[PDB]
Design a protein around this nucleic acid. Structure first.
Ligand code: MG
Ligand code: MG
Ligand code: MG
Ligand code: MG
Ligand code: MG
Ligand code: MG
Lengths: 367, 367
DNA sequence: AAGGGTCCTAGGACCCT
DNA sequence: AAGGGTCCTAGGACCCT
């Protein structure tokens, strides 16, 4: 019943990918740029005051020597992301992706199999790889402690393999569920790992300062929670369930209140191949024409190449737009005539366009 | 590439189920009642003027000796329905259900395998079972005609097996796709079958008188179509594609216009086990209390028994209501604590109720 | 005051760089 | 003027008795 979960989180992912391909960006403060936004930066630039999602203005003031490369084309980040998930899938096949740079793996089976190869005495010699959260003391007679320490050893092998085979560093957290694995992986955050023993779980959740730091509690849920006076993890833990249901719904209230205790029974899901392919472009009110069709060709061309490479065939297309002041969209199936190309696809999309600062196209429903 | 599809349509299904269980209703005009509505009747009662979906008032005027049994509890109809689909699944495993009394089967593989067991001469002796639509002449040298005639023989075996093994009669239509199979199965409608040869396809679609007779064109789409002056199959066939897209959407316009030509490339889908379980009750404004919770207990009890029997476990529940003058609903996941009961389920539903002539409960998301 | 089914759509919540 | 992802929800279209 008890699970050993690992969460793997790569260091400054986009920046790290760039530093690998142009080694002259090591040691130099590096920011990866997307339009007006420095979406991430390496640790050189972080020391200098640069931070993630910071206007390229504010950033090059804090670090005028900041080197900036353009990371709008996600292609290379996307491709490394899958090399990581595939490498982890070798350890155990059930790997759950979260964004491009995070993976969950359920090591429970792996941990148990390794423990069965051990023998009475060497059980006394199981050691931890990496940090133990809250410098908590290990009890080798606690079977849960032994399993999490074995988890931590698998985690160090994963991280070692990632570096040996892909040149990537990252952090890992080992805990009894996904929430806790993900919260603990970030405790020692540059290329290190941390294991959470059960006795320190409450210390972990109460170390957070705003309830939005809980994965699953986001921008809107946080704002609602404040409006009820809920600001700390303990506030949410102790707040009326009944009121929380009425004011948020029985699904949301129940789960986030569970999360507030560090409880999370969600299984690690095999993400497998993606469920969708999309390309976006944004622009400061730079489209007011039905000659926004030029923008939709490039988005298609990239998607069309990405589809051909995946091999599967999509059966639904969607067009998303953002009107200047909250997005609108229209989708429809992809004629079977097509599924087996530029010209017909553009016609569908422009009809979809006409039925309606950003344009996006998405292929989903892949077979 | 060419398909041989069969569509199977049981005769006066509910009524037929009732006549089997109480044989004294044979020969007597029988109507199956649901609230104020005679939802179907046997052919005795049809001769006498009784028709489907007719108020029990109008019906017992046309046939005061009309016997009425109550068919609100679908349990027995549902159970026979699956005995039919399972019987057909023996012929070929890919059977698509449509409602409780219709099934599609792709006989293409079966037809081809039987033709390979034949030998030059006996090919000259392939005959049709049942009607040929439009009394069209068979050409034994036309491979498409030979395959559809073999289809018709499989169809007669299916219908014979249905009667021998379940006591049920019905109609079958054999054609090159689902649209045409379903349209042709009803041509000779009491316990008979009909095969559609390709040359008569246009005669079949133009035999219809209102475009709503096309499966896929329903109440709303028909009303829209009229408002554009489209009233006949030929009107829809010849009407501007462009206008039809703008006025209905690129998905709907394109498919229904294809249907108007008798074209339908949709595959026969293996329906397999149901995707949802639901129970409804209606009442003439007979609920104005939070003591509509009594109505939700019975709906649950029936669903709960149905779930236990299926074996799988649902992960979503929905509550549907109809406010007296167009339905509203609320769903939420089913706590994992529960998935492994009356009391907690009722509490969820009444919360769902309170966030909001008919009450319904649905379990979906089965695993 | 039928009693069920199917799948699609547009939007919104969450997650990451 | 980021550029992507995931899944859930409420409603609506269709089909049948
Ligand atoms: Mg990360
Ligand atoms: Mg990271
Ligand atoms: Mg959060
Ligand atoms: Mg029928
Ligand atoms: Mg019927
Ligand atoms: Mg119709």
């Amino acid at each position: 019943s008890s699970r050993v979960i690992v969460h793997v989180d790569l260091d400054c992912f986009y920046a790290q990918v760039e530093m690998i391909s142009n080694p002259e960006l090591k040691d130099k403060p590096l920011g990866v740029q997307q339009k007006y936004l420095v979406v991430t930066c390496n640790y050189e630039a972080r020391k200098l005051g640069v931070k993630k999602l910071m206007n390229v203005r504010d950033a090059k003031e804090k670090c005028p020597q900041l080197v900036l490369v353009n990371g709008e084309d996600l292609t290379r980040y996307r491709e490394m992301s899958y090399k990581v998930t595939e490498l982890l899938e070798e350890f155990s096949p059930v790997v759950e992706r979260l964004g491009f740079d995070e993976n969950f793996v359920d090591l429970t089976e792996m941990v148990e199999k390794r423990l069965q190869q051990l023998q009475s005495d060497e059980l006394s010699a199981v050691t931890v790889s990496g940090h133990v959260y809250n410098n908590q003391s290990i009890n080798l007679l606690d079977v849960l402690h032994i399993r999490l320490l074995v988890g931590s050893q698998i985690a160090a092998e994963m991280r070692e393999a990632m570096y040996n085979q892909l040149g990537l560093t990252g952090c890992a957290g080992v805990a009894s569920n996904k929430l806790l694995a993900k919260l603990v992986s970030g405790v020692f955050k540059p290329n290190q790992q941390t294991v959470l023993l059960p006795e320190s779980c409450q210390h972990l959740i109460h170390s957070l300062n705003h309830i939005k730091e809980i994965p699953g509690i986001g921008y809107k849920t946080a704002k609602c929670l404040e409006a009820l006076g809920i600001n700390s993890v303990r506030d949410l833990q102790t707040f009326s369930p009944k009121i929380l249901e009425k004011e948020l719904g029985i699904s949301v209230a129940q789960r986030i209140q569970k999360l507030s205790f560090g409880e999370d029974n969600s299984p690690v899901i095999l993400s497998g191949p993606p469920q969708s392919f999309s390309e976006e472009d944004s622009f400061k009110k730079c489209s007011s024409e039905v000659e926004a069709k030029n923008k939709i060709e490039e988005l298609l061309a990239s998607l069309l190449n990405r589809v051909c490479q995946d091999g599967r065939k999509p059966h639904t297309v969607r067009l998303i737009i953002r009107r200047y002041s909250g997005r609108e969209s229209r989708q429809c199936p992809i004629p079977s005539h097509v599924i087996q190309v530029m010209t017909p696809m553009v016609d569908i999309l422009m009809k979809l366009f006409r039925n309606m600062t950003l344009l996006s196209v998405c292929f989903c429903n892949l077979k």
